[PDB]
Structure formats: structure tokens, C-alpha cells
Design a protein around this ligand. Structure first.
Ligand SMILES: *[C@@H]1O[C@H](CO)[C@@H](O[C@@H]2O[C@H](CO)[C@@H](O[C@@H]3O[C@H](CO[C@H]4O[C@H](CO)[C@@H](O)[C@H](O)[C@@H]4O)[C@@H](O)[C@H](O[C@H]4O[C@H](CO)[C@@H](O)[C@H](O)[C@@H]4O)[C@@H]3O)[C@H](O)[C@H]2NC(C)=O)[C@H](O)[C@H]1NC(C)=O
Ligand SMILES: *[C@@H]1O[C@H](CO)[C@@H](O[C@@H]2O[C@H](CO)[C@@H](O)[C@H](O)[C@H]2NC(C)=O)[C@H](O)[C@H]1NC(C)=O
Ligand SMILES: *[C@@H]1O[C@H](CO)[C@@H](O)[C@H](O)[C@H]1NC(C)=O
Ligand SMILES: *[C@@H]1O[C@H](CO)[C@@H](O)[C@H](O)[C@H]1NC(C)=O
Ligand SMILES: *[C@@H]1O[C@H](CO)[C@@H](O)[C@H](O)[C@H]1NC(C)=O
Ligand SMILES: *[C@@H]1O[C@H](CO)[C@@H](O)[C@H](O)[C@H]1NC(C)=O
Ligand SMILES: *[C@@H]1O[C@H](CO)[C@@H](O)[C@H](O)[C@H]1NC(C)=O
Ligand SMILES: *[C@@H]1O[C@H](CO)[C@@H](O)[C@H](O)[C@H]1NC(C)=O
Ligand SMILES: *[C@@H]1O[C@H](CO)[C@@H](O)[C@H](O)[C@H]1NC(C)=O
Ligand SMILES: *[C@@H]1O[C@H](CO)[C@@H](O)[C@H](O)[C@H]1NC(C)=O
Ligand SMILES: *[C@@H]1O[C@H](CO)[C@@H](O)[C@H](O)[C@H]1NC(C)=O
Ligand SMILES: *[C@@H]1O[C@H](CO)[C@@H](O)[C@H](O)[C@H]1NC(C)=O
Ligand SMILES: *[C@@H]1O[C@H](CO)[C@@H](O)[C@H](O)[C@H]1NC(C)=O
Ligand SMILES: *[C@@H]1O[C@H](CO)[C@@H](O)[C@H](O)[C@H]1NC(C)=O
Lengths: 460, 131, 131, 131, 52, 52
């Protein structure tokens, strides 16, 4: 008839928590040598049976923009990139003046020659050498109108560290397991816009394959949507939040290059050797990225008809990025080992007015879009890590048979009584990429104790 | 409701069912509390898991519930904590709502259980010294 | 088995013997498990030792026979795991080949023990709350 | 030592009192026993704290005295260790000088407790085999 | 090819003997057969915590 | 005067002293006379306890 306290151990309840997560990778990346990408020496081998469980009555409140997993992944990837550049060649003695002329009798016009004076293995003697440096990596060191004295762009702020040409920058997918006593939820809803309640919360002990690609606009290889275009944003009122569009169907992109001769081995100091671009045998052509026209057109139209839900009676327009350096306003990526910085003035040149335009032509798929790309070697991605990695050159031609899954738009500041809101692409920090990928998951803490009253009185 | 089929619930599997069917599933949820930049994030997690499990086991073992899951105490339940019926609690809720309505009144309960445990041990010592 | 007397070695000296001399040797066996580049291995050995000890005690403690060294439990023995006589098992074989024969069905036996213990504690709570 | 109410003092704040009144101040005061190069030193401190706590728990678990605070056994107290009256011990003496007076005769007591627990476990197995 | 690090003249290269010990929870199996050729079954197997 | 930024190496500038403008005077520290005198007197009367 009375009530007494009764202790239960094994109660399923949750509190919000922040913890340190694992790394789980596939078993095929361990059978090679040491130091391939990051994951041969570090991550645990996952079992080939991921147990996913669906919870019955559970409704939980998710938040995409308030997540610790994105900040933890950003810190881990920053630490990995700083760690992988520790036992590598630090090209300090390349701060000498570069005597540069044209590349030939009407030759390259994009790569200068820049013969310099370098240090051999014996510090008493010096030897004359040469390379071929790209145009964005050289600044005209001159106090007058002298067209022969040049220097590198890196010997003005902070040094370099040449990337070791035995590791690769290939994005191997990594899983994030949770520690024991912690769980990771996963929202399986279809109309999930990033924030709000979820009615299909599931159980995942270790997340799916997350490929840590690096890109500013035009989010490359990753997970798609499931049934329609889904638009992720924080507020959609202020014009300072990066609106993220998650595509449903991919659009093929391919990028190429001309044929360099070889990497040139120039020895500096006792045993260090930096690799530089040698000749360019053959003709001098352009590096360009190719996107199909009709697929991009109706993909952008579907993004327009999905974005017109939030803005009822306004047209949708697009134009270029809003000016600045080449590292912000251009679609930049890294595959093949050579960095690209591609112009995007032809992709985002169009409009939508609410009326659908069909494209009923299958033999007109030959028409495509070309983007004039530029290639750098001195790389300045992440502020505060020592962002002066020198990417060594590579021998043959390269091909970029890739896949697009998203966009990173940004609404422009509208004027008075406007009905032509324009959307511009924007890059920014990598938390946008790793929050577009990690939008499902949320980490919780299990508290097994719990008290409840019943009629059980303990016998003395 | 002991029959779940495949016994793989993983801290969470009966978090939506009622409390009558959620007191039969304590073993499969209590089984899993224990089981270079990435060579140290693996090793800190094992230490914190051992710390949390040892804290929970000690706090369970202070007030007499040594290894039992459904353990019973003799602390009288104050009516100023729930103000609901017994069958309403055990039928119309799951553990999440109860954790939401109990979370302000936990330290007083823990202190009362530990005081009653000390009284029980003192009375047991006196009774064994009577003989 | 028990008549060794001077027992300071311990370890696994009854391996390869008859189960009749290997089941009654546990009263005298007890346990002796917890009886720079070289400062990072002491730490890892210590963490894996404490993790193994806590895992073994937790698995002994879920099905409710902590600190007994012999637990009689009322899970009915299915014939599909043995299909054979008890006397030749207890008077003919060693523990190693028995483990080699029984390792395909350890998880089902462990789940049955956990379910039986939870049913025991629920019945104990009901019978002790009848009064 | 029961009208404190808000217990946040640990073993620090109750020493110096008589051991008759210092045996009812154990629960939260024993709950307070758990709650680059700096990280390795801190993690070594965590590992040694866990190892010390589990060594104390193993020492309680060897001689059959685990899960209880006031836990009394059947080892005969030799008069040569103390040679003083019980009323003086439990009314005019604190824990600190008792630890000072008993520290030379601890290992014999520990061995006697272990032998008594082994005898009690053998008697328990004999009583199990009788029924 | 490389660059030396000169060994600083206070350390010695004397081979001090070391014992490899298993952690608490593991054992090291040692074969005491005198005619053991390296591969094959043993018959005088002894269990020791640490090596010689 | 202002620290004079002298740049040596790639981004390893060190700041040395520039000019000195105005007249040149001496760095010094100031302690009152009465407080120091009776503080030393009190230290004397508390050191007189240990020496008869
Ligand atoms: C998005 O997704 C796409 C699709 O997967 C990725 O594109 C792949 O990129 C990788 C590198 O980033 C490519 O791998 C490279 O392929 C080169 C050509 O391969 C052909 O030739 C070899 C024989 O040489 C054949 O075996 C092969 O089947 C092809 O026919 C290789 O020459 C490269 O070798 C380099 O690496 C190896 C191992 O590290 C070294 O031993 C070599 O010396 C050399 O350094 C390399 O294997 C891959 O081909 C691309 N896929 C496709 C379909 O083309 C994107 O990278 C990905 N990410 C982004 C940001 O877009
Ligand atoms: C960059 O300049 C160097 C030096 O002027 C060129 O190297 C010379 O090439 C000619 C062949 O045309 C040789 O006869 C010389 O001996 C080379 N000079 C050396 C090795 O010091 C180099 O060819 C130029 N780069 C390009 C792409 O033409
Ligand atoms: C390097 O080349 C020669 C050989 O040392 C030397 O005379 C010359 O001054 C050096 N510098 C440049 C810029 O050529
Ligand atoms: C060199 O660095 C200074 C700052 O130290 C900067 O103001 C200047 O623009 C840099 N030079 C170039 C060519 O960018
Ligand atoms: C929840 O998601 C899972 C994913 O496989 C799906 O099978 C299930 O049908 C979803 N729930 C509902 C109610 O649709
Ligand atoms: C951001 O969202 C909040 C909540 O709806 C709203 O109150 C606020 O006005 C928004 N910010 C702006 C700049 O409109
Ligand atoms: C895009 O931005 C430019 C920059 O001022 C502006 O002139 C132009 O009108 C905008 N819209 C289009 C459709 O180009
Ligand atoms: C991109 O292309 C447009 C037109 O094709 C050109 O005006 C612009 O300078 C190019 N570069 C950038 C960085 O926008
Ligand atoms: C944009 O599209 C219009 C219409 O197709 C075309 O005339 C124009 O050349 C394109 N490019 C730019 C940079 O405006
Ligand atoms: C460029 O490389 C690719 C390798 O994927 C090759 O198929 C292609 O033939 C190459 N281009 C030329 C012009 O040979
Ligand atoms: C991109 O799309 C193509 C077309 O189906 C597909 O074959 C390819 O696997 C996709 N890329 C990735 C990384 O899945
Ligand atoms: C979810 O709620 C329904 C409605 O009461 C219930 O029948 C069902 O059993 C619940 N799911 C679980 C897994 O208990
Ligand atoms: C062989 O094993 C049996 C256990 O059944 C044991 O009694 C016997 O002593 C062993 N043989 C030898 C030579 O030790
Ligand atoms: C096995 O090793 C022990 C170690 O002392 C030795 O006494 C014994 O004779 C050995 N047995 C055989 C058969 O070699």
C-alpha cells in the first residue's frame, strides 16, 4: 500500500555529452607499407557487419549547426596535416633571387623558367641549376622596373615544408566509432532540414564512410539525398549564413592537364632533395574541367524549384563570386596530387522565373561547359597550421573522373523592393563540408542507474 | 516481454516501450558498458570508459545493491516527488520522461539511501553482536 | 588436485588433465592474474590488464553469481550442443578440446544465462513484494 | 555524525573523533575516493588511481568481505596485538593512533583472514555437496 | 645520402640483459625439449611469466 | 623609442631598440624612508627573540 525506492541498473536514458571518438577504416588499407595516407598506422579495423537498429517510439531533437563532431573532425584533420609534414624537406635555401626569362620562343607563357643558384651537398661550393615554376608562385622582386629579378611568394611570410612524395592525398573513407558507454544516434527522416525533431531515430555504433575531400564550391564525392533536393541553412534571413544544397542526382565532371616531362631532382644540403618541374615535351595546352550542359541545366532548375518553396513570389538568379583572390572565388580541389583553381563564371550564369523549361533532346548531349583552370604549387589552405606546403610535380597527364553531390550558395544583399534575389557561390571553412556530411549523427551518454517507486520493501 | 528475437539492443533497444517491458531488458543494455593523433584518442576512451563504469559500480555498491539489477531498498518514497499513481507510472511512461521528472530530486534520494544503508549495517553489527 | 599444499605457483598446472581433477582443483587454484619507448608499454599493459579483469568480473556479475567460483544455474542444457553422455565428458577429456567443441555456441549460452538471471530477479522482486 | 545533512567533507573532516562515532561516516566519504607530456602524466595518475581502487576492492574480495562497509569476520583476535580494553579502544581513542599501533601486525591478520575464507569456502562446497 | 647525429660520449653500448614479460592476463609458453629444431610439437612445455 | 623591426630570414623578424628621443635619464626604484626604517626596526625586535 506504501511506496519504496527501488534501484534499477540498465536504464535506457540519455544526456547530451562531448567525447573523443575513434577512427575505423577498411582492412584493405593496412596490408601496404607504412605512411600511405593517415590511416595505415592508426585506425582500428572495423568488423564487416555494422549493426543498425531502429528505435520504436523514440523522438529526438537534432541540431546540425550545434555539433561537436564537426569541430572534433576539423581539429583531427588539422592535427593530421600538421603531423604528416613533420619528417619532410624544409625548403629554406630556395629564397635566393630567381633569374627568369620567357620559357622559349613563344612557348609556355604560363610557366616561367627561373634559373637560380643553389647549394650542393658541399657547403663550400655552389652550382647553377634551373626549374620551371608556375606564374602564381613567383612575385617580381624589384625596387625598379627590372624584369629579370624574381623571388618565390613564400619567402616573405613563413618558410615552406615540401610535401613528401611517398604519401598520397587520396581521401580514404573513415568511420567515427563511439567509446564504450556512449552511443551515436542517426536521424532517418526524409524531410530533415537540419534542425528539428526526428521521428525515425536509429542506433549506429560507428558512422558510415566519410570521405574527407577538400573543396570550396561544388561539393565533390559524397553521399547524396534520398528522394528530393534538400536545402540546409541556419536562419534564411540574414545574408551571412552559408546555405547548403544537397543534390539528389550527380553530374559528371572531368578535368585534365598537358604532359610534363618529369620531376627534376635538385639536391640541397646533406641529403635533402626537392622535386621541381622539368621540361614540357609536346605542345603547351590548357587545363580545363568539363561539365555536361543539359544535366547541369535541369539540376540547377530543380534546385530553383526546391528553393522557390522558401521564397514564394521571387525569381531566382545566379552570377559570379564577389571578387577577391584566386583562393576564394574559384572552385578549388586536389586530386591526382596536383592542385586546381578553376573559374566558375559559366556554371552560375542563368536564371529561373518559376516556369519550367523542358530539355527534350538526347542527341544534343555533345554540348558541354569548359572552365579555364589555373594550377598552383605553394598551397595556403588552413590558417594557423603552417600553410606553406609545396606540392611536388607529377610526371604524366592526369584525369579527374569525379562526381558532384552538392553546392555551397550564399544569398546576396537585396536592395529595396527587390524581386530578383541572386545567389552567389561561396567557399569558406571546411566545417561546411564536414557538416554537410555529418548532419545525421549525434553523440549521447548512457546513464544506466535509475530509481522508481514500487511496493518492494527490503526484508531485514 | 522477454522475447525480442535477435538480442542486439546496444544501450538503446527498448527506449520507447513501456516500463513493464523495459525492466526485462536490463542485461542486454548493461552488457555493453565496457566493451600518433589517433593512437591516443583510442587509448583515452578506454580509460574514461573504465572510470565511468567503476564510478557507477561503486555508487551502486555503496547502498547495498552489490551486483543485483532490480535491487530493493527500505527508503520510504516521499509523495512530493511524483504525485502520480503506481500503475500510471509503470504503464503510461517510458524511462525518458521519468528521468526528465526526477532529475532535480536525485541527490536527496542518494543521501537517504546511503544513510539507510549505514543504519542497516550498524543494526546488523548490533544483531550479530547480540548472539 | 587440492592435496598440493605448498601452492605458490598457481597458473594453469591442471591443463591437459581429467575434468574430475580439473573441476575440484578450483578450490586451491584461486586466481593469480593480477599477482621513452619502455614507459609507453607499461601503461598499455596496465590498461589492458585492468580492462580484462573488469570485463571478466562484469561477465560473472551479470548472471548473478559474483564471488562463488562455481555457479549452478537453471538454464536447461540443449541437447544440440553436446548430443552425448555426461560421464565420458567429465572423466575422459580436457578443458582445451572441450573449448574447441563448445566455442560455436558460447553467445547463445551467455544470452540464456542473462535472460534467466533477469527472470530470477523479476520473480524475486514480485515474491518479495507480495508480503 | 548523522546530523550533518550536507555531506561534502570526506574522510578528512571526521578524523580525530572517537572510532565509535567515526564508523557512521563512511558512505559519501568513500564515494570521494574517485571523484605532449602533461597528458601522459595525467593519464598515468588516472591509471594509478583506478589500480589503487581495484587493489583495495580485490583485497576486500579475497577474504569474502566485499560489498559491505562494516564487515566483520570470524578470525580470532590475538591479544598480543592490542593488550588493551575494548571500551578504551572504542571510546577514548581515534583512528590515527590505532593505525599507528596496528601497522606492525597487518600481514598476519590478512593471512589469517585469507585462510579463514578458504576454510569457509571449503565448508560451503561441502555443504553444497551434502544437499 | 643522410646526415649524422654524433652519439654523445656519455651513453654506452654495453648489452645489458633484459627480460620480456607478458602483461597481467597473459602467459608465455616455453618448450623445454632439448632436441627442438624450431618447428614442431613440444612435449615438456612449461609456463613462465618472463623470459630469460 | 619604438622597437625597430629588423627582418632576418623568412618571417623571423626580431625587434631591437630604435632611437632614444628626448633627454636620457636613469632608471631607478623608490622606497619610502620611514616605512623601510620602522619595518627594519620591527624585523630587529622580532629577531631579538632568537638572540639574547
Ligand atoms: C572523387 O572520385 C574519383 C573517382 O574515384 C577520384 O578519382 C580517382 O583519383 C585517383 C587519385 O586521386 C586516381 O588514381 C590514380 O590513377 C592513375 C591512373 O590509373 C590508371 O592507370 C593505372 C596504371 O598506372 C591502372 O591500374 C588504373 O586502373 C587506371 O587505368 C594512376 O596512375 C595513379 O597511380 C598513382 O598512385 C599509385 C598508388 O598510390 C602509385 O603507385 C603511382 O606511382 C601513382 O603515383 C592513381 O592510382 C583514380 O584513377 C581516379 N579515379 C578514376 C575513375 O579515374 C577522385 O580523386 C575523388 N576525389 C576528388 C576530390 O575528386
Ligand atoms: C631554362 O634555362 C636553362 C638555362 O638557360 C635552359 O637550359 C639549357 O638548355 C640548353 C638546350 O636548349 C642547353 O644547351 C644548356 O646547356 C642548358 N643550360 C644549363 C643546363 O645550364 C633550359 O632549357 C630553359 N628551359 C626551357 C624550358 O627551355
Ligand atoms: C650563381 O651562379 C654563379 C656561380 O656561383 C655566380 O657567379 C652567380 O653570381 C650566382 N647567382 C646568380 C643569381 O646567378
Ligand atoms: C609580404 O609580406 C607583407 C607583410 O609582412 C605584406 O604586406 C606584403 O603584401 C607581402 N608581399 C606580397 C607581394 O604579397
Ligand atoms: C525508418 O528508417 C528505416 C531505414 O531502413 C526504414 O526501414 C523504416 O521504414 C523507417 N520508418 C518508417 C516509419 O518509415
Ligand atoms: C535568426 O533566427 C531567430 C529565430 O527565428 C530570429 O529571431 C532572428 O531574427 C534570426 N536572425 C535574423 C538576422 O533575422
Ligand atoms: C552579378 O553581380 C554583378 C557584380 O556587380 C552584377 O553587375 C550583376 O548584375 C549580377 N547579376 C548577374 C545576373 O550577372
Ligand atoms: C573568370 O571568367 C570571367 C569571364 O570568363 C573573367 O572575367 C574572370 O576574370 C575570370 N576569373 C575570375 C577569377 O573570376
Ligand atoms: C551568360 O549567359 C548569356 C546568355 O546565354 C550569354 O550571352 C553570356 O555570354 C554568358 N556569359 C557571361 C559572362 O555573361
Ligand atoms: C590522359 O590520361 C588518361 C588516364 O586516365 C588516359 O586515358 C588518356 O589517354 C591520357 N590522355 C592522352 C591525350 O593520352
Ligand atoms: C558519381 O556518379 C557516377 C555515375 O553513376 C558513379 O559511377 C560514380 O561511382 C559516382 N562517384 C562516386 C564517388 O560514387
Ligand atoms: C511504439 O508505440 C506503439 C503505440 O503504443 C506501440 O504499440 C509500440 O509497441 C511501440 N514500439 C515499441 C518498440 O515498443
Ligand atoms: C597423462 O594425463 C593424465 C590425465 O588424465 C595424468 O594422470 C598422467 O599423469 C599424464 N601422464 C604423465 C606421464 O604425466
Ligand atoms: C622437463 O623440464 C624439467 C625442468 O626442470 C626437467 O626437470 C624434466 O626432466 C624435463 N623432462 C623431460 C622429459 O625432459
Amino acid at each position: 500500500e506504501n511506496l519504496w525506492v527501488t534501484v534499477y541498473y540498465g536504464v535506457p536514458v540519455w544526456k547530451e555529452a562531448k567525447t573523443t571518438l575513434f577512427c575505423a577504416s577498411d582492412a584493405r588499407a593496412y596490408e601496404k607499407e607504412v605512411h600511405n595516407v593517415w590511416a595505415t598506422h592508426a585506425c582500428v579495423p572495423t568488423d564487416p557487419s555494422p549493426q543498425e537498429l531502429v528505435l520504436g517510439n523514440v523522438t529526438e531533437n537534432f541540431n546540425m549547426w550545434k555539433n561537436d563532431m564537426v569541430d572534433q573532425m576539423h581539429e583531427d584533420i588539422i592535427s593530421l596535416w600538421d603531423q604528416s609534414l613533420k619528417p619532410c624537406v624544409k625548403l629554406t635555401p630556395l629564397c635566393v633571387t630567381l633569374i627568369c626569362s620567357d620559357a622559349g620562343s613563344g612557348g609556355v607563357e604560363e610557366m616561367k623558367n627561373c634559373s637560380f643558384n643553389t647549394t650542393t651537398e658541399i657547403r663550400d661550393k655552389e652550382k647553377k641549376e634551373y626549374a620551371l615554376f608556375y606564374k602564381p608562385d613567383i612575385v617580381p622582386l624589384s625596387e625598379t622596373n627590372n624584369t629579370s629579378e624574381y623571388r618565390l611568394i613564400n619567402c616573405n611570410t613563413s618558410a615552406c615544408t615540401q610535401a613528401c612524395p611517398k604519401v598520397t592525398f587520396e581521401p580514404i573513407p573513415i568511420h567515427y566509432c563511439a567509446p564504450a558507454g556512449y552511443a551515436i544516434l542517426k536521424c532517418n527522416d526524409e524531410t530533415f532540414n537540419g534542425t528539428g525533431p526526428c521521428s525515425n531515430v536509429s542506433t549506429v555504433q560507428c558512422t558510415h564512410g566519410i570521405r574527407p575531400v577538400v573543396s570550396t564550391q561544388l561539393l565533390l564525392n559524397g553521399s547524396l539525398a534520398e528522394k528530393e533536393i534538400v536545402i540546409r541553412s541556419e536562419n534564411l534571413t540574414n545574408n551571412a549564413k552559408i546555405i547548403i544544397v544537397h543534390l539528389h542526382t550527380p553530374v559528371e565532371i572531368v578535368c585534365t592537364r598537358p604532359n610534363n616531362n618529369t620531376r627534376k631532382s635538385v639536391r640541397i644540403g646533406p641529403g635533402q632533395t626537392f622535386y621541381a618541374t622539368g621540361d614540357i615535351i609536346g605542345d603547351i595546352k590548357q587545363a580545363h574541367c568539363n561539365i555536361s550542359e543539359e544535366k547541369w541545366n535541369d539540376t540547377l532548375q530543380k534546385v530553383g524549384i526546391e528553393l522557390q518553396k522558401h521564397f514564394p513570389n521571387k525569381t531566382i538568379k545566379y552570377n559570379q563570386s564577389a571578387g577577391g583572390d584566386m583562393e576564394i572565388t574559384t572552385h578549388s580541389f586536389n586530386c591526382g596530387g596536383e592542385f586546381f583553381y578553376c573559374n566558375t563564371s559559366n556554371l552560375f550564369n542563368g536564371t529561373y522565373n518559376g516556369t519550367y523549361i523542358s530539355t527534350n533532346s538526347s542527341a544534343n548531349s555533345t554540348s558541354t561547359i569548359t572552365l579555364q583552370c589555373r594550377i598552383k604549387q605553394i598551397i595556403n589552405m588552413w590558417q594557423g597550421v603552417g600553410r606553406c606546403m609545396y606540392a611536388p610535380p607529377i610526371a604524366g597527364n592526369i584525369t579527374c573522373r569525379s562526381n558532384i553531390t552538392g553546392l555551397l550558395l550564399t544569398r546576396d544583399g537585396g536592395t529595396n523592393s527587390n524581386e530578383t534575389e541572386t545567389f552567389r557561390p561561396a567557399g569558406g571553412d571546411m566545417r561546411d563540408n564536414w557538416r554537410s556530411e555529418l548532419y545525421k549523427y549525434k553523440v549521447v551518454k548512457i546513464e544506466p542507474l535509475g530509481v522508481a517507486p514500487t511496493r518492494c520493501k527490503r526484508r531485514v | 516481454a522477454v522475447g525480442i528475437g535477435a538480442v542486439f539492443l546496444g544501450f538503446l533497444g527498448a527506449a520507447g516501450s513501456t516500463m513493464g517491458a523495459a525492466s526485462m531488458t536490463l542485461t542486454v543494455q548493461a552488457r555493453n558498458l565496457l566493451s600518433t593523433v589517433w593512437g591516443i584518442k583510442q587509448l583515452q576512451a578506454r580509460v574514461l570508459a573504465v572510470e565511468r563504469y567503476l564510478r557507477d559500480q561503486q555508487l551502486l555498491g555503496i547502498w547495498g545493491c552489490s551486483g543485483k539489477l532490480i535491487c530493493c531498498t527500505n527508503v520510504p518514497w516521499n509523495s512530493s516527488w511524483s504525485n502520480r499513481n503506481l500503475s500510471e507510472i509503470w504503464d503510461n511512461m517510458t524511462w525518458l520522461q521519468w528521468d526528465k521528472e526526477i532529475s532535480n530530486y536525485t541527490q536527496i534520494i542518494y543521501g537517504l539511501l546511503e544513510e539507510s544503508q549505514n543504519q542497516q549495517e550498524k543494526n546488523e553489527q548490533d544483531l550479530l553482536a547480540l548472539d
